[PDB]
Amino acid sequence: WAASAEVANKPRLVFVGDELRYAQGANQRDVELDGFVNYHWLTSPGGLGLPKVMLEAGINAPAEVVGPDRSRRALIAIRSSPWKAGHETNPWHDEFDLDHGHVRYFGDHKPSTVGLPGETKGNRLLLEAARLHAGTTREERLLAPPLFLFRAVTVHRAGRAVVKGHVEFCGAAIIERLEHVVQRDPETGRSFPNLSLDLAVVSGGEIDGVDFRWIDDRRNAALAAGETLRHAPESWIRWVRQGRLAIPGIRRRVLASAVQSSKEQQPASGSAEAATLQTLYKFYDGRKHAFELLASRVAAEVFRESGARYKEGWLSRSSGDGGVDFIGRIDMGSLKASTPVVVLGQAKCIQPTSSVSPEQVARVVARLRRGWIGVYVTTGSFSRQAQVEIIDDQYPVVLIAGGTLAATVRRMVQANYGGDLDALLASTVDEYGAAVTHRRPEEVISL
Amino acid sequence: IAWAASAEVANKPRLVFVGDELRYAQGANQRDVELDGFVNYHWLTSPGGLGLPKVMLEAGINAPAEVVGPDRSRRALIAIRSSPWKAGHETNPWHDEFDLDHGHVRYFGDHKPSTVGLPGETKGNRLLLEAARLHAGTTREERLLAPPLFLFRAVTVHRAGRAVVKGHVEFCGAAIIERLEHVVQRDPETGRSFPNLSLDLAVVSGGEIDGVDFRWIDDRRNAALAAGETLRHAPESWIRWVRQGRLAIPGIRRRVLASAVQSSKEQQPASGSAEAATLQTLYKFYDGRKHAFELLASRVAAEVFRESGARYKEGWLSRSSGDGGVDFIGRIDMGSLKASTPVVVLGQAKCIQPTSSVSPEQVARVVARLRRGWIGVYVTTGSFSRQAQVEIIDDQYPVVLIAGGTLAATVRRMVQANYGGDLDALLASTVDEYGAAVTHRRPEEVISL
Amino acid sequence: KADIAWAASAEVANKPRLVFVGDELRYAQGANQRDVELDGFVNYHWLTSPGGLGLPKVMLEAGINAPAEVVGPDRSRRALIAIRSSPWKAGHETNPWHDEFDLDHGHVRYFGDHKPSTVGLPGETKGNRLLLEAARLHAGTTREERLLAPPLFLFRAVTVHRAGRAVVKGHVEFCGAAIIERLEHVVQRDPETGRSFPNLSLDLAVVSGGEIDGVDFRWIDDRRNAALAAGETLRHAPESWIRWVRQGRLAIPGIRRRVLASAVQSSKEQQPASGSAEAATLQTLYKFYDGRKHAFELLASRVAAEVFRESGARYKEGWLSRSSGDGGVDFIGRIDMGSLKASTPVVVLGQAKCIQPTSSVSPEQVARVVARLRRGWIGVYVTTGSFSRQAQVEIIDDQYPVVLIAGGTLAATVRRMVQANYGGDLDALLASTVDEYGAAVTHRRPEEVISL
Amino acid sequence: KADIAWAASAEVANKPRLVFVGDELRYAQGANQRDVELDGFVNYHWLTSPGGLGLPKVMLEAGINAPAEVVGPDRSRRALIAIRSSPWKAGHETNPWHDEFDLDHGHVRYFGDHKPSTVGLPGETKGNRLLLEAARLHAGTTREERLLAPPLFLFRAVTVHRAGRAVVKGHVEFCGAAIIERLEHVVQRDPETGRSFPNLSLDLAVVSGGEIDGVDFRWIDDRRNAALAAGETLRHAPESWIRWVRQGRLAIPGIRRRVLASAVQSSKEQQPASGSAEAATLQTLYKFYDGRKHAFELLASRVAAEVFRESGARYKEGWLSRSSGDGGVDFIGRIDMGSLKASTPVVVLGQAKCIQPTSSVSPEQVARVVARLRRGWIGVYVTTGSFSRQAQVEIIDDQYPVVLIAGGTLAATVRRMVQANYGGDLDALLASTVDEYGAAVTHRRPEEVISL
Ligand SMILES: [Mg+2]
Ligand SMILES: [Mg+2]
Ligand SMILES: [Mg+2]
């Protein structure tokens, strides 16, 4: 009573990546075990008076919960074992892509299995669940058991014994596709049928975790299915209510690096850098090529500020647009211990309140050979989709928006001038800017 | 001065190197040496002290009159001038292809869509057939009578900082016609198909000088000289071709690397030096400690990339046991702070004998792992073979080479600064601190490490 | 009489008469074999069978033609097969199985003479029987068998110009000599009568002429010469054909006719003809998928699959990226490059954009798909409109491995698919795409297409 | 006898009678149709035609079989086509044009029953007629036509083992139900009598069974029942087949059978059989090219050309990189993929290396060729030996776009080329490579192959 109420009042958030302590026996009451969060306490507090949620290799599920009106499966605890990363090669291996909220899972049908798929407990559970996850009604999706994902992880807290003794939470998942597959046992050369699952890992919403009180609610026989969504992710509830169509929006999405919006890419509102940026925009609006020269100078300064040895090559054109405007070179490495890196640059003078589309960046990325990097210089900013495209696809492109451009221009004004700011602008417009070289980019290595 | 001037011309070599920008003007003098900050073409090809007509260089195929020697009649030379060039920006399937580093030039003839008949109904293509008939000679006499093809290209130059598109050419060498074929082209403005000639040309090597003496032309234009007496000022490669034939071509063609190649001596520590004994101790130690040397290589490479002031980020080791293509993984932050772009680095370690070298294959094993925006680093106690470096320079591989010398030097620096003592500690540190990492991580993942 | 005919024959035999690819010849079924020129153009019957040779005419009726078999000293042989194709019709064809001429790359797709009313298996018809009998020798297992193989002289009824006017009928254009590179079974449908029927589809390789862009008709004179053995008929033959006779199928990948032309197509070229059926088809496709993005993505995946299989490439159906929203890649597929025992999987990244047929696709838009490509990956861009000149230029220059499918190609492909699968009902295909695009969506990585 | 037959037939049609791909069946032509098991295996005649139906046997004579045409209430239809592939060579086949099985990717290459003693065009013989008449329906232009299409049930004679007892004959292996994906003309040579003859070549797509890796044989029972229309026989058919009946050609690239297995082949799987003719061929090739590097390079270019053209892909002959010395790339080729209107070329980088057949190729050697590959380029590696396990797993894990040609594939390919072009004379090909390797060399960049 008081213990179960104590349980129902304390959130048990488990985040994606948390290394849980899984062990034979142990205690459902101890919150932490062997320096790690105890799995058995996390899934079954013990104050509920409920059996443990077993997490064996493959598919797991506790006994069915007989509610007052209807019965249901509480959850499905799936544990994946292999952590190959190139060590073990197999097309039937579980494929985890949690950053895009997608997991390719495989059934528990074995080469030595006598029955037809899936008469195995795991695949039977997976079929039962899949029938509910594909439900076209809210009532069928309400009964649909979530797929809690776990994997064998490696972790050395004291700097030793990282292997084994751990499991890692990988999120809650919806079955979006079930397929029958055929596999061949590489040991015996035997072809056996199996099941395979497309899993969509839902978003945690505000946080990247899941409250395991949801499981407690689903294991509560006094509660109907409709009253078990209090602590469930808003994404999951949205799937229960809207269905498959709600999946593309509720799917988990993780980016490696941070994305900066327009305000972060632009200098402050009433700053001198803002006025400077506006003067630059008013100057190079009708002057494209001089702005490309200025862009070459700016990019040069940017790469030289990072400590990299930069070499300005040439400007590609004096007319007719093009995807590449200027060429540079970066000798990455120590003195007499370096390698040449061809740098492809692109200048785009646009209104500081306007933005650069991902295809415009891709026009620069597409040129990049192996050992080449890109650089984009603009008076405006870059769209969110451009940054997402660059980060998620790992495009080797350095971004130089209105803020960095303004700062570099001001600094260069302070560098060489007579007390004015039109020194750099005049240096860009007149003289040098007319010269162009009709040579291949890679040839920048030779100069 | 019918002899004295010609003698003064005959005793002065005119070395023209590949890449030399020459001044070509209409109605240019043959006496003026330097013109408008560049060498005058007409004086170069015809000094004027000879009293001979100048060798014209119009856009396309050019050739002076036949030189009737004492026994045989011969064509002195065929001056070729490639027509278009502008960064390319020259999109058309019949464009001349210049690959001077490998001594190869694909040249297209001057047959026009309005030209009636077949190639070579034009003078130039006729000269091409006439020449190629001798360039494919089976005898020494035929190859002796064969006229050299001097190649020139329209080039945009910069005298005193101002760009000049026209009025200048660029010497590309003397080539041998190694192939002639017939092609069919379609003119965009005409839409009609017309036949044409196609030449695969092999630009000969000028030796270490990489140039030719234009007195050779003077000898070939000399009617008093037989064909056998005109090879004094010719490059040894061409003479080798005339004497040997087709079998000489693959060895006498021009071969120029984009950058220099370090010898094994250059990559290895000097004899009797401290870093020599240091490298010896390193090899002696890591001969049985592979993973430890992998860790050491990671640290060394990290220090190397750190030395330039560049932003480097160490990662992890691939395998603590077994064999593979990559050993360690790092990252290089390219660009300003908090706005840079991550560059994944793949590092390979290989502790071999300091005298032994690393083959192009095992380097390519690391090169073939590099995606776009990724670079590599190879650390060894030995050197990198000449051919490996050749394939790194020529094929444009993004790989930092750290041989025995760089390894020894960087190691001594490391032990001087970080460990403040002898190498021993550091060595122990390469076994105790790490060297063991049975990790399960993807190379790209380091971007968010 | 005897001396006259003999000296005339010897005169014809000793004088070369070169016909070049694209030569406009006057064809009259009643024309004689004496005049070297007729109605301002070269007389066909003189060029193929001069009067001084004393031989019957080489008739060039509609379709497949062949003179009576010549009994040589060594053995009997078929001199040649003369093919007259029509109309091609400047992109205004209504039959999806019309002859496809690509003389710039030395390939011609030619369909047999099997008709909807033909009873029995192909080739019961004359033409197909000749094509099979020729196919036996164009794939001869020895040089001796290939010596007997009758050259396929291609001709097509074209419109010429005389005195500033246009003459539509009465002239044929020479398209070179061809080798039967492939001969396969096909099923066609008559769009007017609604009948379906088997037929033979042939991949023909137009041989390079060598020193000239054409052939000497004395080759045929020798092949038609009963006094000459088959091995004695190669004295006026192209070097490429001699090389093929010697080597066989090994020579074919290197003896095809090649014309160096601009690979940049105008907007008009990428689009179908003005009043063509493919134009109306394209208009229907644009008006339908104007508000149906992902259905057009599915259609584009199927069309891409068809286009790839058309080149013999073994394409594997992958999936669609999403059922809502937008992105760089719209669909994923896979091609197995190589053979059955030896092959490597190349991942196909697809992109579909339904814009106005008159509108154009920018270089940025194609670069967005190209940038996603890794080594071992290829791309494909399907659109109802055209690709801009700058886009194509940047593709050619920087060597972008992307297959372009514009309005004309899309319309033709879709028409072929519909005629060959749904009884010529476009609505079946369109409704299929509308109803099945959601279930064609997975959130898998492109690489995972290898596991299919 | 009516009530008994009704009850029997009903009892048969009530029970699902399944057969999976790989299942071994005892075939005795003189056996009965009542016993479920025969000599320790499932009785073929019971599975294909149970006695409860009172229907005749579906005989499986060597080659192409088919029962009598079923006259339904709607139309007349062929029940099925039962195909028996006889030779059990494991590589030791003496016939270059033997049936190829790639069941892991649902692809089977099958050859017709045209013989040297056969007089007439393909297919005057019964089997080829059945295949042509079937292909007419497999490429049916409507769902109604595809409804009538008889499924090709594949059977392969495989030596079985029963607890220590290997039996060579009397057993067939079910290899699935196939759709005729392609049917073309082929010319073959008989290595025993030395006679050449035309024949039919078939590319077959083995469909996925879906829920089961096989078929329910009640499907055929319904296809044999005259009381049923063609649209009433899909109740027990595989879902992939129903999808093909609906969609047609569009369904093919997405219904093929797929077995998830390791592509890593051992040295035995890469090498020909021990007593094979391919082994002798490979030994001859090794003993010949042990000191002839560049001739082997030319041979490898030709072999790669042959491999890339099997599917029908447009492979262009390029050139050899060197006449002397050694380099990373030995030859260059080109593959124009898909479009055919605005064709995209794919640069092929080739590497040849003649080593001992018992030796293998290291991952470094492969990566030396792979490193040279740009975007939209593919590699090909030809060797007399094999490829090491580490090389294979390194190609797989990193997705290297390189086609591997080991000793087995090389020997088979060369043998087929020789039999199909040089009258079975290997020396003609070898000496051709010796004579022509020097002139096949240019010094052009690989990219220049685009201008070919
Ligand atoms: Mg190593
Ligand atoms: Mg799209
Ligand atoms: Mg080799």
**Extents of the domains making up chain A:** 1-255, 256-447
Query: What are the respective helix, strand and coil percentages of chain C, to the nearest 5?
Result: 35, 25, 40
Using the Cβ of C118 and the Cβ atoms of chain D, whether some distance falls under 8 Å is answered with: no
Residue of D103, D216, D260 to mutate, testing the A interface (most A Cβ within 10 Å of its Cβ): D260
B352 exposure class (CB count in 10 Å sphere: 0-12, 13-18, 19+):
middle
Using the Cβ of C374 and the Cβ atoms of chain B, whether some distance falls under 8 Å is answered with: yes
- Tell me how close the Cα of D211 comes to any Cα of chain A, in angstroms: 6
Q: Which of B88, B91, B93 shows the shortest C-beta gap to C260?
A: B93
Using the Cβ of B442 and the Cβ atoms of chain C, whether some distance falls under 8 Å is answered with: no
| Chain-chain contact of D21 with A191 (C-beta, under 8 angstroms) | yes
| Chain-chain contact of C308 with D337 (C-beta, under 8 angstroms) | yes
Interface partners of D (3+ CB pairs, < 8 Å)?
A: A, B, C
- Please name the residue of chain D whose CA is at the shortest distance from the CA of residue B359: D364
Query: What is the Å distance from ligand 2's center to C313 Cα?
Result: 24
Residue partners of D221: CB distance under 8 A and separation at least 6? D12, D13, D17, D50, D53, D236
- Tell me how close the Cα of D28 comes to any Cα of chain B, in angstroms: 53
Beta strands in D224-340 (DSSP E): 259-260, 314-320, 331-337
Question: What is the structure's resolution, reported in angstroms to one decimal?
Answer: 2.0
In the stretch 274-333 of chain D, residues with CB closer than 8 A to chain C read 302, 305-317
CATH of A1-255, picked from 3.40.50.1970, 3.40.50.720, 2.30.280.20, 1.10.3720.10, is: 2.30.280.20
- Using an 8 Å Cβ cutoff, are C313 and D335 in contact? no
- Using an 8 Å Cβ cutoff, are B392 and B358 in contact? no
Helix D277-289 and helix D293-308, axial crossing angle in degrees, nearest 10: 140
Question: If DSSP states are collapsed to H, E and C, what string results for C277-313?
Answer: HHHHHHHHHHHHCCCCHHHHHHHHHHHHHHHHHHCCC
CATH of A256-447, picked from 3.50.30.60, 3.40.1050.10, 3.40.1350.10, 3.40.50.300, is: 3.40.1350.10
Helix spans in C155-217 (H): none
Experimental method: X-ray
- Size of the A and D interface in Cβ pairs below 8 Å: 42
The architecture of the domain spanning B1-257 is Roll (2.30)
- CA of residue D165 relative to chain centroid, distance: 29
Using the Cβ of A376 and the Cβ atoms of chain B, whether some distance falls under 8 Å is answered with: no
Measure the CA angle with vertex D217, ends D213 and D218; round to 5°. Answer: 130
Quote the CA–CA distance of D196 and D192 in Å, as a whole number.
11
- Please name the residue of chain C whose CA is at the shortest distance from the CA of residue B94: C260
| Chain-chain contact of B184 with C22 (C-beta, under 8 angstroms) | no
Residue of C321, C334, C368, C388 to mutate, testing the A interface (most A Cβ within 10 Å of its Cβ): C368
Residue partners of D131: CB distance under 8 A and separation at least 6? D64, D81, D112, D123, D180, D183, D200, D202
CB count, 10 Å around CB of B270?
10
Q: Tokens 């001037």 map to which residue?
A: B5
Using the Cβ of C396 and the Cβ atoms of chain B, whether some distance falls under 8 Å is answered with: yes
Q: Has domain D1-260 been given CATH number 2.30.280.20?
A: yes
Class of domain C261-452: alpha beta
Residue of C387, C443, C444, C450 to mutate, testing the A interface (most A Cβ within 10 Å of its Cβ): C443
Query: What is the Å distance from ligand 2's center to C395 Cα?
Result: 19
Across the strands, what pairs with D353? D383
Residues of chain C contacting residue D100, judged by C-beta atoms under 8 Å apart? 340-341
Token pair in block for residue B45: 């090809």
Using the Cβ of C370 and the Cβ atoms of chain A, whether some distance falls under 8 Å is answered with: yes
- Using an 8 Å Cβ cutoff, are A384 and A413 in contact? no
Query: What is the Å distance from ligand 3's center to B93 Cα?
Result: 30
| Chain-chain contact of A306 with B340 (C-beta, under 8 angstroms) | yes
The dihedral region occupied by D126, where left means phi > 0, alpha psi between -120 and 50, and beta the remainder, is: alpha
Helix spans in C360-401 (H): 363-370, 389-397
Residue B248 dihedral angles phi and psi, to the nearest 5°? -85, -25
Query: What is the Å distance from ligand 1's center to D394 Cα?
Result: 15
- Tell me how close the Cα of B184 comes to any Cα of chain C, in angstroms: 5
- Using an 8 Å Cβ cutoff, are D44 and D26 in contact? yes
Using the Cβ of A335 and the Cβ atoms of chain B, whether some distance falls under 8 Å is answered with: yes
| Chain-chain contact of B182 with C212 (C-beta, under 8 angstroms) | yes
- Using an 8 Å Cβ cutoff, are A31 and A38 in contact? yes
CA nearest neighbour of A321 among C265, C394, B92: C394
Considering every ligand atom, which ligand is closest to the CA of B291? Answer: 1
Q: Is B119 helix (H, G, I), strand (E, B) or coil?
A: coil
- Tell me how close the Cα of C47 comes to any Cα of chain D, in angstroms: 31
Token pair in block for residue C428: 């079946």
Query: Distances in Å between the alpha carbon of D179 and those of A168, A355, C9, C168, D75?
Result: 46, 53, 57, 45, 21
| Chain-chain contact of D328 with B102 (C-beta, under 8 angstroms) | no
Considering every ligand atom, which ligand is closest to the CA of B325? Answer: 1
Quote the CA–CA distance of C37 and C46 in Å, as a whole number.
8
Residue partners of D393: CB distance under 8 A and separation at least 6? A89, D264
**Long-range CB contacts (within 8 A, 24+) of C44-47:** C44/C172, C47/C17, C47/C19, C47/C217
Quote the CA–CA distance of B46 and B5 in Å, as a whole number.
13
Q: Tokens 């495209």 map to which residue?
A: A389
Token pair in block for residue D372: 């040279």
Query: Distances in Å between the alpha carbon of A64 and those of A51, A219, C287, D114?
Result: 12, 8, 53, 64
Q: Which amino acid is at D359?
A: S
- Using an 8 Å Cβ cutoff, are B54 and B106 in contact? no
Q: Has domain B258-449 been given CATH number 3.20.20.540?
A: no
Residues of chain C contacting residue D133, judged by C-beta atoms under 8 Å apart? 121
- Using an 8 Å Cβ cutoff, are D64 and D126 in contact? yes
Quote the CA–CA distance of D202 and D141 in Å, as a whole number.
19
- Using an 8 Å Cβ cutoff, are C184 and C112 in contact? no
Q: Which amino acid is at B399?
A: V
- Tell me how close the Cα of D451 comes to any Cα of chain B, in angstroms: 6
Residue partners of C123: CB distance under 8 A and separation at least 6? C112, C114, C129, C131, C132, C200, D121
In the stretch 157-216 of chain C, residues with CB closer than 8 A to chain D read 182-187, 189, 196, 198, 203
Q: Which of D325, D368, D394 shows the shortest C-beta gap to B360?
A: D368
| Chain-chain contact of A358 with C368 (C-beta, under 8 angstroms) | yes
H-helix or E-strand spanning residue B196 = strand B193-203
- CA of residue A132 relative to chain centroid, distance: 28
- Using an 8 Å Cβ cutoff, are B205 and B253 in contact? yes
Task: Name residues with Cβ closer than 5 Å to ligand 2, which is an ion.
Answer: C 330, 352-353
Q: Which amino acid is at D251?
A: A
Quote the CA–CA distance of D215 and D211 in Å, as a whole number.
10
Quote the CA–CA distance of C148 and C229 in Å, as a whole number.
10
Query: What is the Å distance from ligand 2's center to A268 Cα?
Result: 37
